[PDB]
Design a protein around this nucleic acid. Structure first.
Ligand SMILES: NC[C@@H]1O[C@H](O[C@H]2[C@@H](O)[C@H](O[C@@H]3[C@@H](O)[C@H](N)C[C@H](N)[C@H]3O[C@H]3O[C@H](CO)[C@@H](O)[C@H](O)[C@H]3N)O[C@@H]2CO)[C@H](N)[C@@H](O)[C@@H]1O
Ligand SMILES: NC[C@@H]1O[C@H](O[C@H]2[C@@H](O)[C@H](O[C@@H]3[C@@H](O)[C@H](N)C[C@H](N)[C@H]3O[C@H]3O[C@H](CO)[C@@H](O)[C@H](O)[C@H]3N)O[C@@H]2CO)[C@H](N)[C@@H](O)[C@@H]1O
Ligand SMILES: [K+]
Ligand SMILES: [K+]
Ligand SMILES: [K+]
Ligand SMILES: [K+]
Ligand SMILES: [K+]
Ligand SMILES: [K+]
Ligand SMILES: [Mg+2]
Ligand SMILES: [Mg+2]
Ligand SMILES: [Mg+2]
Ligand SMILES: [Mg+2]
Ligand SMILES: [Mg+2]
Ligand SMILES: [Mg+2]
Ligand SMILES: [Mg+2]
Ligand SMILES: [Mg+2]
Ligand SMILES: [Mg+2]
Ligand SMILES: [Mg+2]
Ligand SMILES: [Mg+2]
Ligand SMILES: [Mg+2]
Ligand SMILES: [Mg+2]
Ligand SMILES: [Mg+2]
Ligand SMILES: [Mg+2]
Ligand SMILES: [Mg+2]
Ligand SMILES: [Mg+2]
Ligand SMILES: [Mg+2]
Ligand SMILES: [Mg+2]
Ligand SMILES: [Mg+2]
Ligand SMILES: [Mg+2]
Ligand SMILES: [Mg+2]
Ligand SMILES: [Mg+2]
Ligand SMILES: [Mg+2]
Ligand SMILES: [Mg+2]
Ligand SMILES: [Mg+2]
Ligand SMILES: [Mg+2]
Ligand SMILES: [Mg+2]
Ligand SMILES: [Mg+2]
Ligand SMILES: [Mg+2]
Ligand SMILES: [Mg+2]
Ligand SMILES: [Mg+2]
Ligand SMILES: [Mg+2]
Ligand SMILES: [Mg+2]
Ligand SMILES: [Mg+2]
Ligand SMILES: [Mg+2]
Ligand SMILES: [Mg+2]
Ligand SMILES: [Mg+2]
Ligand SMILES: [Mg+2]
Ligand SMILES: [Mg+2]
Ligand SMILES: [Mg+2]
Ligand SMILES: [Mg+2]
Ligand SMILES: [Mg+2]
Ligand SMILES: [Mg+2]
Ligand SMILES: [Mg+2]
Ligand SMILES: [Mg+2]
Ligand SMILES: [Mg+2]
Ligand SMILES: [Mg+2]
Ligand SMILES: [Mg+2]
Ligand SMILES: [Mg+2]
Ligand SMILES: [Mg+2]
Ligand SMILES: [Mg+2]
Ligand SMILES: [Mg+2]
Lengths: 101, 73, 119, 88
RNA sequence: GUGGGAGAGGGUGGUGGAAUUCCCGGAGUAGCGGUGAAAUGCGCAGAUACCGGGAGGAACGCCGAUGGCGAAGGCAGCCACCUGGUCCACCCGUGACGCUGAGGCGCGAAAGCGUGGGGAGCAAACCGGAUUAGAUACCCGGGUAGUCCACGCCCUAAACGAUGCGCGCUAGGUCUCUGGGUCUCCUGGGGGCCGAAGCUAACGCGUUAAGCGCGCCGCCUGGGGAGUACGGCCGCAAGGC
């Protein structure tokens, strides 16, 4: 059981219905792989520095979770199946390293 | 010699390991998308080394550029 | 015959030749010139003068399409790049801006032996 | 990897008395844990040599400790081997 | 043992953008390319230059260093899993359990070999164009093995610090990576430079010894013949010891 951070970037063109469905599939797949969600930040659409899937912007989801390590990779796979999900990056959480303190 | 300013001295309290914070990290990138040298950033070895990885992370996430076009000239 | 009146100017400069392509704002070309288009044949195409003549020819050709303002885009490091720039600068064309777009690999491909001791 | 809990389990298991972290028995035990874990790592990933060197070194250290025990107290040696199930 | 730290140390899977080539579409015209100068070559079946979309293979720009890791070879986009080494603090545990190491066994850059796959760029051989007295070369246009992956072989090298491993002792100064501390500074591990004593044929080395000592291994004994011949062992072969 380790503490990770899931970054997901999806299609900015989604109406609230499709979007809700996508987040639903994210929750579903998450529980399926045994990840407890400690917190969440929905940053919404933001302007990408380079076009992703031909689209100038993207919708951002961030989950801080705790899950069994063995299946983390196996998780990302599933998360990448959905067409509307254009990015997935999972990262082991780390204590912040402050500069100029 | 880069006597204009150092990016660290031009900044306040911040987290080097946070890849999602653009308005700071952007200050560490050049006119082009390139990561700045220790001369410009005024960081230390360890600091710079962490900055590099977090910046690359931000790049992959689509938040920061890999490269940019050079204005003027 | 279009009458674009504002567009882009691409300068492709190498140690061998200089060649200029003027396009509409979408990137689609209108006219173009080069050291070969002018009477120059051999190595003289790499000349800064050849470049001047080239840029000027392209500009004058784009005047016939009634173009006024241009965005300059520079690629490659070669003799007579800046000369082509200064050529376009007063051709009668207004140069709105200049940008160096020269492609740099992130080290994809092994260079020819000529360009090696690098990657 | 190896969690603190497993480590404490094997330590308290093989400790000659309460509070003993450093005995030959404890050391051989810990090493046996690491060895078995590494070998199970090397059944898959058998192209990873740099680790196999580590395996060699651990095996060596264990054999030296066991040898020492065998010299000092053949009883404790036999008991340890039987408890661990080494020698194949 | 407990608690902490840094790292391109290794293996597996996934993934990101830049560029080259090819394909498709748009727009567009007489050349592009290349060199000392050229020519071969490519281009009116529309190339070069420009925009858009797609396919694939290989390598990871900036960070980046005089930096880091590893026993050596060697290791550099990012993420996760598996895994080796190592350093510091505490002074807790065992009680000389140590050092070296013939033979053995494993690892071992590149090239090369076998089977299967892959093949973008580069490129032995080879096909051409130049240069030249000639040019079986340097320069230019092509191009196969190969370079890439998996599995199995091969075992070499300027495999280099041309410096075997371990431990003790013998001024300092300075730069740096990485811990700890009463954090001007002190203390420990690693990487550099200049230098005390000393050493060295000299160059130079000098707490990272080539100094002062002890232990153990490998090796040398004038040059050519020759790393050849014979024998043996190993290898599919090339060939290695
Ligand atoms: N080793 C891979 C790298 O590990 C990095 O981090 C590595 C190190 O920073 C970290 O150090 C660990 C830690 O527990 C602490 N600092 C002390 C500990 N002894 C270390 O663990 C060490 O020893 C054990 C055997 O006991 C090995 O299995 C392990 O590989 C080694 N790192 O352990 C990590 C794994 O070895 C980063 N994740 C990334 O660069 C990369 O994944
Ligand atoms: N790709 C990640 C790496 O994969 C390695 O092994 C992988 C690659 O070396 C190997 O090549 C694959 C190939 O199978 C597949 N048919 C095509 C694919 N594009 C390749 O993958 C890789 O190819 C080369 C490096 O070989 C890279 O330049 C490229 O970026 C990368 N995509 O395929 C392997 C997996 O099938 C190692 N696991 C490790 O270095 C790392 O995880
Ligand atoms: K180095
Ligand atoms: K052959
Ligand atoms: K400190
Ligand atoms: K002297
Ligand atoms: K010297
Ligand atoms: K040998
Ligand atoms: Mg997807
Ligand atoms: Mg020319
Ligand atoms: Mg040892
Ligand atoms: Mg590594
Ligand atoms: Mg790896
Ligand atoms: Mg591409
Ligand atoms: Mg076409
Ligand atoms: Mg051609
Ligand atoms: Mg061709
Ligand atoms: Mg023809
Ligand atoms: Mg022809
Ligand atoms: Mg025709
Ligand atoms: Mg055709
Ligand atoms: Mg023809
Ligand atoms: Mg082309
Ligand atoms: Mg394209
Ligand atoms: Mg193909
Ligand atoms: Mg560099
Ligand atoms: Mg004590
Ligand atoms: Mg006692
Ligand atoms: Mg030894
Ligand atoms: Mg031996
Ligand atoms: Mg080899
Ligand atoms: Mg090879
Ligand atoms: Mg082969
Ligand atoms: Mg083959
Ligand atoms: Mg070629
Ligand atoms: Mg050639
Ligand atoms: Mg020839
Ligand atoms: Mg001659
Ligand atoms: Mg063949
Ligand atoms: Mg050397
Ligand atoms: Mg040295
Ligand atoms: Mg060295
Ligand atoms: Mg030494
Ligand atoms: Mg030796
Ligand atoms: Mg030792
Ligand atoms: Mg030191
Ligand atoms: Mg080093
Ligand atoms: Mg000196
Ligand atoms: Mg003296
Ligand atoms: Mg002297
Ligand atoms: Mg050394
Ligand atoms: Mg010494
Ligand atoms: Mg000899
Ligand atoms: Mg010898
Ligand atoms: Mg003789
Ligand atoms: Mg000889
Ligand atoms: Mg030989
Ligand atoms: Mg004989
Ligand atoms: Mg023989
Ligand atoms: Mg035979
Ligand atoms: Mg032969």
């Amino acid at each position: 059981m380790r503490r990770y951070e899931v970054n997901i970037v999806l299609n900015p063109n989604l109406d609230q219905s499709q979007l809700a469905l996508e987040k639903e599939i994210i929750q579903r797949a998450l529980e399926n792989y045994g990840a407890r969600v400690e917190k969440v930040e929905e940053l919404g659409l933001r302007r990408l520095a380079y076009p992703i899937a031909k689209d100038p912007q993207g919708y951002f989801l961030w989950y801080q979770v705790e899950m069994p390590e063995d299946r983390v990779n196996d998780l990302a796979r599933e998360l990448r199946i959905r067409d509307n999900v254009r990015r997935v990056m999972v990262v082991k959480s780390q204590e912040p390293f402050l500069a100029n303190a | 010699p880069s006597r204009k300013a150092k990016v660290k001295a031009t900044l306040g309290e911040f987290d080097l390991r946070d890849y999602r914070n653009v308005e700071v990290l952007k200050r560490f990138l050049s006119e082009t998308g390139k990561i700045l040298p220790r001369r410009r950033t005024g960081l230390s070895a360890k600091e710079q080394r962490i900055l590099a990885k977090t910046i690359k992370r931000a790049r992959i996430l689509g938040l920061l550029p890999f490269t940019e076009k050079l204005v003027r000239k | 015959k279009r009458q674009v009146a504002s567009g882009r100017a691409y300068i492709h400069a190498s140690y061998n030749n200089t060649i200029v392509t003027i396009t509409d704002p979408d990137g689609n070309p209108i006219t173009w010139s080069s050291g070969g288009v002018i009477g120059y044949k051999g190595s003289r195409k790499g000349t800064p003068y050849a470049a001047q003549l080239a840029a000027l020819d392209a500009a004058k050709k784009a005047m016939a399409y009634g173009m006024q303002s241009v965005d300059v885009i520079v690629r490659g490091t070669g003799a007579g790049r800046e000369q082509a720039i200064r050529a376009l600068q007063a051709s009668g064309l207004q140069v709105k801006s200049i940008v160096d777009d020269t492609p740099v690999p992130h080290n994809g491909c092994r260079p020819k032996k000529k360009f090696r001791k690098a990657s | 990897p190896i969690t603190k809990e497993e480590k404490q389990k094997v330590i308290q298991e093989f400790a000659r008395f309460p509070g003993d972290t450093g005995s030959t028995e404890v050391q051989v035990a810990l090493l046996t844990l690491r060895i078995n874990r590494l070998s199970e790592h090397l059944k898959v990933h058998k192209k990873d040599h740099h680790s196999h060197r580590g395996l060699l070194m651990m095996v060596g250290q264990r054999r030296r400790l066991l040898r020492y025990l065998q010299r000092e107290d053949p009883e404790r040696y036999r008991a340890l081997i039987e408890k661990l199930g080494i020698r194949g």
